[PDB]
């Protein structure tokens, strides 16, 4: 995997490739790695598909039960539940998860959770095997309070390079926009992004 | 893979006299090739005229001393403030150590004090609880350097009476507190010279019927 989440003026955008691998064979070339744990709290999944999937399901269950009792949870709360699972089961898990969500008070927020189970709140985050190739690019090109169009371009160009160099990344570039307006799904095909 | 043990170095030494007993130990603490502390005491007054040291892995050493100190406390609560005799303390420590026979305390333990006849006493332990009363014991990293010197100077081993054709042995006798401290200081300066994990400082705890006195001496800091 190549995955990332980026905060901007109106909220936050999540981005991911669509490649799942079992060795050098691509088991699924149209994977949806962007998964909903709540209305406007989503996550990007990297590492073991089975582990990240089992975790995301448990988190979705916890947040649904939270909402039933205490109303809409914060993005911080969601990240804390992810952390709790990843940290307490660090010995048996291979999961690298980015949590992104939109509050009306807190606007856009991004929390990244690496293997250890540690939590890190950031303006933007990158993760997965293909992220190594874009630390240089993303650092030079990220600005705070970007527009929606600027942020989409930033993610599209970033993941395009990550895909280009990483063999474990490819297919389509899926994105998910989280703003006050609502939730918007975007897709970008090879013919477009490859020739950027 | 995680390794739960470590070696904090240093060395300790116990000598018994007629009406007294000493328990000495250097103040240096180390890991690998680094010095952690130049003054970190590991010889402790545990009450009831019992001094104790558990040299080797300091985490296990501190844990044990902490448990024995606590054992002394509960002995008073459960048995009407009765004084814990040195022989009783020894047997109690055996059970503490053997309690972890299959995941041991990595320490050579030495306690000192007076027996019930008022005479000086030194007991020494292996890591899993084996113990024996002696006049003399050195423990820890430099035990191999110091111990044979003690055999020669405290128990007069390999020393015969001059002119007796190696037939009559040098008679055993108790040593004065002044003579014992001389042997302790020489033992540690000698060990400091040839063992890298020993140095910085020397702290001696002397035990008489009057109580527990301390003495400190500088050691080479290289």
């Amino acid at each position: 995997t190549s995955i990332m989440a980026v905060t901007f003026k109106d909220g936050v955008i999540l981005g991911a490739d669509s490649r799942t691998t079992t060795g050098a064979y691509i088991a699924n070339r149209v994977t949806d790695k962007l998964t909903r744990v709540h209305d406007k709290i989503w996550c990007c999944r990297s590492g073991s598909a089975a582990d990240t999937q089992a975790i995301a399901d448990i988190v979705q269950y916890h947040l649904e039960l939270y909402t039933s009792q205490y109303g809409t949870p914060s993005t911080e709360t969601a990240a804390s539940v992810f952390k709790e699972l990843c940290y307490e089961n660090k010995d048996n898990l291979t999961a690298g998860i980015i949590v992104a969500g939109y509050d009306d008070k807190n606007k856009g927020e991004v929390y990244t959770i690496p293997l250890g189970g540690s939590v890190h709140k950031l303006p933007y985050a990158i993760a997965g095997s293909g992220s190594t190739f874009i630390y240089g690019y993303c650092d030079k090109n990220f600005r705070e309070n970007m527009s929606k169009e600027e942020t989409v371009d930033f993610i599209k160009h970033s993941l395009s390079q990550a895909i280009k160099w990483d063999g474990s990344s490819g297919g389509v570039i899926r994105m998910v926009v989280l703003t006050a307006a609502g939730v918007e799904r975007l897709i970008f095909y090879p013919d477009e992004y490859e020739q950027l | 893979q995680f390794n739960p043990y470590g070696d904090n170095g240093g060395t300790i030494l116990g000598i018994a006299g007629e009406d007294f007993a000493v328990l000495a130990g250097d103040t240096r603490n180390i890991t690998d090739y680094s010095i952690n502390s130049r003054y970190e005491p590991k010889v402790f007054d545990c009450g009831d005229n019992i001094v104790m040291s558990a040299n080797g892995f300091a985490a296990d050493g501190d844990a044990l001393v902490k448990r024995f100190k606590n054992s002394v406390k509960w002995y008073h609560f459960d048995h009407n403030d009765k004084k814990l005799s040195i022989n009783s303390a020894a047997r109690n420590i055996q059970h503490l150590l053997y309690g972890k026979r299959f995941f041991p305390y990595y320490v050579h333990t030495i306690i000192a004090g007076l027996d019930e006849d008022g005479k000086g006493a030194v007991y020494s332990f292996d890591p899993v609880g084996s113990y024996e009363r002696e006049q003399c014991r050195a423990g820890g990293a430099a035990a191999s350097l110091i111990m044979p010197f003690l055999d020669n100077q405290v128990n007069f081993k390999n020393q015969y009476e001059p002119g007796t054709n190696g037939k009559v042995k040098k008679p055993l006798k108790y040593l004065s507190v002044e003579e014992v401290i001389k042997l302790v200081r020489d033992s540690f300066t000698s060990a400091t010279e040839r063992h890298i994990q020993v140095g910085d400082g020397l702290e001696i705890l002397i035990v008489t019927k009057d109580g527990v006195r301390k003495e400190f001496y500088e050691l080479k800091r290289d």
């Binding site: - | 191999s144 350097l145 055999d151 390999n158 020393q159 040839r194």
Partner: protein, 204 residues
């Protein structure tokens, strides 16, 4: 299967006032089994004395090798080899087997016949020279010997006094080691006389 501690044994050397002393135990065993109580570890070539601890086959081999080399030296040089020179010869010979070494802990001792200066030296198995003013130790009870020597030794001891010091250093160190002991020999070396004494020590 640690070559340095199969057979067992110890050697110790000291300096005094116009004299040197070198001493060794007599044990040769195969791990726990004591086999021989006559196995001496000190040899001499002219007035230069060499003690060797470690794997006994190599102890024998090196003695035979150094006898060989010192004999050819004497024939060509027309004089006896000196301790300083012999020390260099040992170091050369040991390092020549850098990647397949003799598992030994040799110790040179002797008085230079020209200058009269007492000389002692030790080596590791690979040839590294250890020169010393005071004393050299070697063997399975090297730790014990270091502790005994460092405490008992003083400078400028007379031959009769130096004998007592070195003997007590060896004996009490040997009794704290399972693979050392079973008898002992001490060489007291003056400028032009050498006395050899067999010590009475505990036989366990």
């Amino acid at each position: 299967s640690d070559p340095s501690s199969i057979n067992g044994g110890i050697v110790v050397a000291m300096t005094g006032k116009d004299c040197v002393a070198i001493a060794c135990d007599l044990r040769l065993g195969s791990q726990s089994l004591g086999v021989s109580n006559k196995f001496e570890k000190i040899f001499h070539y002219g007035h230069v004395f060499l003690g060797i601890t470690g794997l006994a086959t190599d102890v024998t081999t090196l003695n035979e090798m150094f006898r060989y080399k010192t004999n050819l030296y004497k024939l060509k040089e027309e004089r006896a080899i000196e301790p300083e020179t012999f020390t260099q010869l040992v170091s050369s010979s040991l390092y020549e087997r850098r990647f397949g070494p003799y598992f030994v802990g040799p110790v040179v001792a002797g008085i230079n016949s020209k200058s009269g200066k007492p000389f002692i030296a030790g080596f590791d198995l690979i040839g590294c020279i250890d020169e010393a003013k005071d004393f050299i130790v070697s063997g399975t009870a090297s730790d014990q010997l270091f502790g005994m020597c460092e405490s008992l030794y003083e400078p400028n001891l007379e031959p009769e006094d130096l004998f007592e010091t070195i003997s007590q250093a060896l004996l009490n160190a040997a009794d704290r080691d399972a693979l050392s002991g079973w008898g002992a020999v001490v060489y007291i070396i003056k400028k032009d006389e050498v006395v050899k004494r067999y010590l009475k020590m505990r036989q366990d």
